[PDB]
Enzyme design. Structure first.
Site, mmCIF file in Angstrom:
data_model
loop_
_atom_site.group_PDB
_atom_site.id
_atom_site.type_symbol
_atom_site.label_atom_id
_atom_site.label_comp_id
_atom_site.label_asym_id
_atom_site.label_seq_id
_atom_site.Cartn_x
_atom_site.Cartn_y
_atom_site.Cartn_z
ATOM 1 C CB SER B 29 -9.476 -1.440 -22.038
ATOM 2 O OG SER B 29 -9.642 -1.978 -20.769
ATOM 3 C CB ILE B 31 -10.458 -2.368 -17.026
ATOM 4 C CG1 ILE B 31 -11.946 -2.832 -17.157
ATOM 5 C CG2 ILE B 31 -9.683 -2.899 -15.930
ATOM 6 C CD1 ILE B 31 -12.521 -2.814 -18.679
ATOM 7 C CE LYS B 54 9.531 -7.616 -36.894
ATOM 8 N NZ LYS B 54 8.932 -7.768 -35.578
ATOM 9 C CB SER B 75 12.715 -13.619 -32.785
ATOM 10 O OG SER B 75 11.870 -12.539 -33.027
ATOM 11 C CG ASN B 77 6.059 -12.213 -34.959
ATOM 12 O OD1 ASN B 77 5.621 -13.282 -35.060
ATOM 13 N ND2 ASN B 77 5.823 -11.460 -33.950
ATOM 14 C CG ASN B 145 16.057 -4.672 -36.915
ATOM 15 O OD1 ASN B 145 17.132 -4.190 -37.007
ATOM 16 N ND2 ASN B 145 15.846 -5.837 -36.348
#
Ligand SMILES: [Mn+2]
Ligand SMILES: [Mn+2]
Lengths: 320, 320
Positions: B29, B31, B54, B75, B77, B145
């Site tokens: 990008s 910008i 994940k 949570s 994912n 994790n």
């Protein structure tokens, strides 16, 4: 036999703009493949400079047309692209925009430094006001879809697609003024005419469909009401003959279909397409498309732009 | 010297998952480059199977751990990824999810065929409930994790990045439990340790930052409140040592920064990132990042996921 552009115009445009645009990617979705029974490819013009493919036709037009100013009318995407292209050369831009265009598009045009001039939401108002502004500013008019340099610029999309998806069987293109559809049709039919070129059009703005059916140009009688804000223009005198002769079929889609398809792309592909770009996706998902031969397997849909008002869209997003 | 995974684990994971995942693109990008003064590259894991990276750690874990069922807490994912991975082998999944997780994530988990089990929004509740469910189902726990196979799977991102962006000077990674950060750190520091590995973390969930500062694991005392719903977990016992020793710095970002950065990506890159993925973008845009040496020029930010509730997001989207 001879139309207002040729394939050679497109090849030339491509060379002349390629170092100033993005070679946007082609992405795929197994979920959409499952839904349609086809092998879909998505040409991501939403990632193009300014948020849409219109930078193609704008750059080509600015470079080619040799000025005091450039002028156009636009629902927003051609306007911002033209503004950007002109700014690169130090040329001021005046953009005539319908009062009911999305805010995000109005604001971007102003951010690129244009003088914006609001008109009524009709083809007639767009055209008449742009003509007056052209006269008043002594500027050069760069039409969003009927100008040959613009059409030739848009057609370059097909040159990329045919290279990126070598096994492609059809392209599906949203249609408004027919600039992109026409440029793509010229291109595909010159290189590999076995490849289908299909238009996708809102039922709520179905001039192109009606024209094809009747065998003559039939503009929208009333100004269209559609969430597909970028394809409210009727086809014009330069693009119609090309569409008449070279486009294989035209598929119409309802507002509901457009909304559903747009939302699907957002949720499943994570691509922030504008609803206009959701027109072609809706087409391939539609009932009528099921009548396309099973030999037409590899289909590239042009995701034409991503200039959408996030907060406006909440109005229609469907809860599960 | 020795951590719970090695580079060899990551190389192996990559071979073993590569034919089942997407080699996601790196996008740019101009910008964002202008805003930061750096040369940014965006690793689009939002385009990964299931909407986030994940799938990497889940596939690796399912294939490797030889079962009656798989169990986890998430949570959203990791849960949906684990569900998908398990379904491919015909194994049922039980997913423990905080009651306050996004609806879109709750629904996707159910759509993939999992049994969802809501818990309270705390690390303690997640862990305790998953332990109980594991016992009750006689299933196999696959931690989101701290499981070595999972961490090694996430690290494969860096193998791709280092190949896709050969001139890369730093990776910027959002951190929750530290699975991805740890896998990436192991990988980068094994191949080319001159390349910086930076974490990005919400100020509202800043355990990783605080741990690094103190030189020891300091979990969040209260359950975090953050729009970055995917990084509310504290770092754990397996990822901390890796983070302690191999991660170069940690940048914290406020809720406002996260919202602004997320919105910017949506509007300017047309990529429907979830706010958690907006954490790393915020980091590079932040004031503190300006203190990073100008030699650190080419920076790849991992856009970790695109699982966001469109209608929820309207709450915070900022009008012009
Ligand atoms: Mn029409
Ligand atoms: Mn944290």
């Amino acid at each position: 036999a001879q139309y207002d552009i040729s394939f050679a115009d497109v090849e030339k445009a491509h060379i002349n703009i390629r170092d100033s645009i993005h070679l946007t990617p082609v992405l795929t979705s197994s979920i959409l493949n499952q839904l349609t029974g086809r092998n879909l490819f998505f040409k991501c013009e939403l990632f193009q400079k300014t948020g849409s493919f219109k930078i193609r036709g704008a750059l080509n037009a600015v470079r080619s047309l040799v000025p005091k100013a450039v002028v156009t009318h636009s629902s927003g995407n051609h306007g911002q692209a033209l503004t950007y292209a002109a700014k690169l050369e130090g040329i001021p831009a005046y953009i005539v925009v319908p009062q009911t265009a999305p805010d995000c598009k109005k604001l971007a045009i102003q951010a690129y430094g244009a003088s914006i001039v609001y008109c009524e939401p009709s083809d007639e108002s767009r055209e008449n006001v742009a003509k007056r502004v052209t006269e008043e500013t002594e500027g050069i008019m760069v039409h969003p879809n009927q100008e040959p340099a613009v059409i030739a610029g848009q057609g370059t999309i097909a040159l990329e697609v045919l290279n990126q998806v070598p096994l492609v069987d059809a392209l599906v293109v949203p249609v408004g003024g027919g600039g992109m559809l026409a440029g793509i049709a010229i291109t595909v039919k010159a290189l590999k005419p076995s490849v289908k070129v299909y238009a996708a059009e809102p039922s709520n703005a179905d001039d192109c469909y009606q024209s094809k059916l009747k065998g003559k140009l039939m503009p929208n009688l009333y100004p269209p009401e559609t969430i597909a804000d970028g394809v409210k223009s009727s086809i014009g005198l330069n693009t119609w003959p090309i569409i008449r002769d070279l486009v294989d079929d035209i598929f119409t889609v309802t507002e509901d279909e457009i909304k559903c398809a747009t939302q699907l792309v957002w949720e499943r592909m994570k691509l922030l397409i504008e609803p206009t770009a959701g027109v072609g996706v809706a087409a391939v998902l539609s009932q009528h498309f099921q009548t396309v031969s099973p030999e037409v397997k590899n289909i590239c849909i042009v995701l034409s732009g991503g200039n959408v008002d996030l907060t406006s869209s909440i109005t229609w997003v469907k809860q599960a």
